[PDB]
Structures are given as structure tokens and as C-alpha cells.
Amino acid sequence: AQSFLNRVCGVSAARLTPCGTGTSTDVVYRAFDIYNDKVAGFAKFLKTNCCRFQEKDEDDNLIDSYFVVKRHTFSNYQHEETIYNLLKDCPAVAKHDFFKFRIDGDMVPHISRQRLTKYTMADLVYALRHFD
């Protein structure tokens, strides 16, 4: 419940408002480029597994700073933890965080990305190369 919000918001301020709905994964419409045997292209898609929490500022004014937290399998958890542990020095990598919450009697893994931007670069490119 709210303890999930408390755990996700680790140390950096506490100005969070859930744009999702508690533990529900808010769905959005975002552009993607993907190529994997079954499909190939560069088009729009529907993003599903993303609990988006926009961080506001003092006076509760919203600002562009989003804490995306995602749930996935267990092997991926260790794999991404290891690789991020390798590369956690270059200033070009967004700060990560790894933990497992108990929504129910389940040890579900969680991955936390802090201070992101609302739109990626693919959205900006796709908005100009498919103008209308």
C-alpha cells in the first residue's frame, strides 16, 4: 500500500504523488524501436508494466522528475543488478536501485530508476519524422 511508496522513495526527498494507482501498473502510449525475430520496426506501442511516480517540489508543484519502478522475473533481477554494479561509475548511467517488496505473500522483485524524464528521445524523434 503506502509502505510500497515509502520503500520506493528511499532517501531522496519524499515529494511523491502516484500517477499510477497504488500497485497497479499504469499503461501509456509511447514510441519504441524493437527488432526480435517475430517483429521488426520502429512504431508506437502500449507500455504496460510501469508504476510511474512523478516527484513534485516544494509547494507541491509538479516538475519533470519521475521515479519509474518496474517488476519483472527473478533472473532478470540478478542479471541487471550485476551489470549495473559493473557500470556504476560513468556519469552517463541513470542511478538504479534494486529491492523486493511484499505486495502479498510473494517475493516480487522491483527495479527503481530515479529522476527520469517524461519523454525519451525516441518520442521526440518520432514526433518529427512522422509529423501531422
Binding site: 525475430d37 527473478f74 533472473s75 540478478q78 550485476t82
Partner: protein
Amino acid sequence: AVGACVLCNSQTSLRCGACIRRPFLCCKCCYDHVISTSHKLVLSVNPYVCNAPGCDVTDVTQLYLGGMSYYCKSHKPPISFPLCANGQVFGLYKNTCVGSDNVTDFNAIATCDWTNAGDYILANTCTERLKLFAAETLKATEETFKLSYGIATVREVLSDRELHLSWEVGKPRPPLNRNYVFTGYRVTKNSKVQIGEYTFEKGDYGDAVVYRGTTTYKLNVGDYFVLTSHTVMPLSAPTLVPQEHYVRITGLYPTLNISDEFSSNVANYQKVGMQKYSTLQGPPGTGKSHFAIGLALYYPSARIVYTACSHAAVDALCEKALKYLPIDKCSRIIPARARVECFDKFKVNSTLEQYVFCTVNALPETTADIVVFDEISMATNYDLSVVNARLRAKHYVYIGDPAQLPAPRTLLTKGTLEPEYFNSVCRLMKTIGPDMFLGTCRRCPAEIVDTVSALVYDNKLKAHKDKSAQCFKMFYKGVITHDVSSAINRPQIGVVREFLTRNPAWRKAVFISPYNSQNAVASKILGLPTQTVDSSQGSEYDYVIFTQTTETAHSCNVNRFNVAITRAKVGILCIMSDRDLYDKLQFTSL
């Protein structure tokens, strides 16, 4: 680069050429070996050839010093002496060559083909160092044999993961599995480079094969895949450490009032603590995994490492320790390849742990306090001394069972290998008996233990549970088609597909097939939990399905069947085609 001899262990530095492993030999010892055996090449600080370019004599029988180099009779200078010693071979150090005569056994070791059981049984009867040499040279022979395997000259590729396979003519085309390793080489009149470490398994249906590799291109026509061999490392440590008895404990931290199932085994644990080491002789299914867990519970204070031969056994042990022991003190060491999946829940290769787990071929060179290893039939004498060398602890624990199947030993194709002669430990455990014995199985109910005790075992075995009344059988034959190596009995698969629905709680029943082709095609057809005998064993499953394809020494093996049926928990159903074996058991026919 000098050492002792092997037969007499005297200080010398000569090695034989024809002997593949090239071991240190003394003057008289090597002289006798070359006199008896056809080995006509000796290696030294320099090779032994007729130094004259107009000659190419390499036989140690005749080679004459040309003052500073070796010559033949047709090139021998006048003031010069032959270097065939007085009933010896001239070389380095002669005045301290202690005598030893038992060379004929070593002569046979370097002569026999390892195709007859006599070779293997005799190799388990020589000296310690002779045993190590025999094991290493057998390993090298196996590696050379698998190196001389088929070169898969392919022509087509189906998909980004599926390809079409074909081989050359003349060399043994190996089967396809994740255990093997292959690599393609692009032949463009140049750039014969490795395209990635490729492992291969047969596709789903027809002339379709799935290709997977470290890298992944879309393979061309002209390339091919060759099986490469891995080098064999020499070893020094003894296969078995000596025994020493004691009076009091050897410094272990007990846990008062921890459990109940292992209080009765505390006497056994202290008997282990009375000695340098201890072994285990018991039938499978006796919960020896949980017995080892409780033994760890007796002294769970030191920083320990454990290991097992295969993956399924060590994964089940990891699960058992997780269930009993606290989680964040045990780890499982995984290999770099990891082409076979493992316990993907624990620490990923965290060597800095208190009760570590690993595999035989991925063990480190660290040290510990106590240790246990799974199965001695699965292990040879080479790995015993290997782990003796790399790991050195104060106490050692070993487990095993005579009624398990031994290591493959593909080169041994004639006769049957006695269970005591599977390794040195097997002979010791059949000669002096057990250190502690446990003959009650918790996995299987009364009917299965009665059948196994009556049929293959001695009439001594017992259990604790009554019959589950889930016994069934079938006999009709079905036809095969001579597939890769062996074949698949497809009509039985169709019958099982049609019939299964009536059995409600059998959708997760563990399908059994020792043959990879059938093991895969069964999951291709419907998707039952697939499994083979080797990947089975040591464990137990609630619902199991056994399938015998046809009749053959492999499929009619009593040991294979009995170790297969020792894995039933609450229900099982087996198909079969043999008549007297069908009459042998004491279950419901249907």
C-alpha cells in the same frame, strides 16, 4: 624439470615417447619398458635421432654417440661408444637408480585399448601413482577419441535459431545436446575464424535442427562444425587420504536441542568425528540428502563448501538446505558456460559463503573444514584426487550407493563392470563395508520397496508408508524408426496423449526418457514434464511417467530400471514392452 621414477620412484629425468602421457622413467625401468613394449622413442633434454641428416633412426635399440650427438651404425665415428647401457638405457643419473621390477602391469596399461573390462578392472588394482597415471591416460584417450568426431558439413539453415545439419563421411558424427560444444569456421579461402561457441540440439520435426551459439550469425552453406577436446591436467594428491582414529571431538561447535530426526544419528556423527573422514553406504531414497542436512545441523558453525556430481542433485540439495538451514549462509557456484540451467533463486556464484555448493567441474582451489560429495558411482578416481588436490580440509564426508549406475565409460563396450570396481571407493565400500548404513526410504510407499527388495535388492528393505494404489502398467509394443542413434516409439506417445485425460492429477507427471530424441519429441507433442534417468536419480517426484521405447541392453538394464523406479512418491505409471520383465513386478497390470 626432473623428478622421481614411477615404478621405482628413483631420481631420474627420462620420459618415453610412444607413451602418450610421457611420464618420468628411470634408467633400468625405462630400459625394461622399451625392451618389452614396442615403445621405440625416448625423450630427454634432447630428442633421440640419428643426428646425421642422411639417417632418421629414432629407435633406442641402436643409436651411437658421435661424440656429442647420436648416430647410426652407417654413420658411427671410430672413437665413440654406443649409448645402450649395460642392461639399461644411458641417461641422467645412473648410480642411484633404485630397483623395481613390476613393469609388466605398467606395460599393459600403456598397451591395452580400454575396450575390455580387464583393462579397467586391472587399472583399479595398481599402485596409487599408477592409478593416477591410468586415469589421466584414459581421460586423454577419451579426449582424443571425441576430438576425432564427425565434421558436420551442412548445406542449409532454416531460421535464426533453426538450421539444417549434415555430416561428412568417415568420422563418428556425435549426437546433439547442450553438453557438447561446437564452433563453425568460415572458409572464404581465408579468415577461418571461430564464429562462436555453438551448442546443438535437434529441432522439433523432420529435417530441422535448432542452432544456438555464443555469437549468432545466419550460417552459410560451406561451413562445418567440429568437436574440440579439452586438455587434461596432471595431478599429485592421493585418491584416498589415510585414516586416523581419535578419542575426543576434533573441535566442532554443536547445537543443543535443534531437531529430532537426527538426534538418533548423533552417535554416527561422533563416529565421523572420531576419524579423519567417513563414507556412506545406503540404498537410494533413504533421505540421505535430509540426513546430510541434519548432519550439517549438528555442526553448522564452520565455513564450509559442498559439491555434487550433476546439477539436479545439487539443486535438490540446495532446496533442502533452504528449507532447513538459514538461507544467507549457503551459496551455489555456477560455471561460465551455464548451458544447463540451475537453481536460479540463490546467490549467483558467491564463493564467500559459509555452506557453499558447486559442481564437479567448476570447483575452486580453496580450502574448508568439512565437505561432502554426492554419489561415487557417478564419479571416477580421477576427480577424487583432483578435489583432494584443489581442496584440503580437516574432515571429509562421502556418499554413494552400489545399486546406482556407474559413469558412462563409453570406451568400455565389452562385458559388465562390477559395482565394487566402479572406483577405488566402491571397492573399499564393498570390501570393508559401510561407515554407517541407512536402509529405509521415505520417498516410496510399501509396494515399491517390496518390489525393489524382491526383484533386484536383497530381501531386507523396508519403508514407512502403505500403498498409494496408483499402480498401472501397459505392454503393447509399438514401432520405432531408427532415429538419431536410437529411435522413438510414437504410437505409445499417441496412446498416452489420448488416454491421459482420465487421470486428473497426472498432468504434471514427470515423463521419463533416457533418449534425447524421445525426451524432446514427447514435450513437442503435448508438453509433459520431460526428464532422463541421469538428470533424474537422488531426487523424488509425486507424479512420474516412465516410457521404455524398445528392448536393448541399455533399455533392459536392471540397474537403470530400478534406479528409475526409486523416484516415485505418490503416483507413477510406466509403459514397457518386455514380457518377463512385465511379469517380474508385483503391481496392477491393466
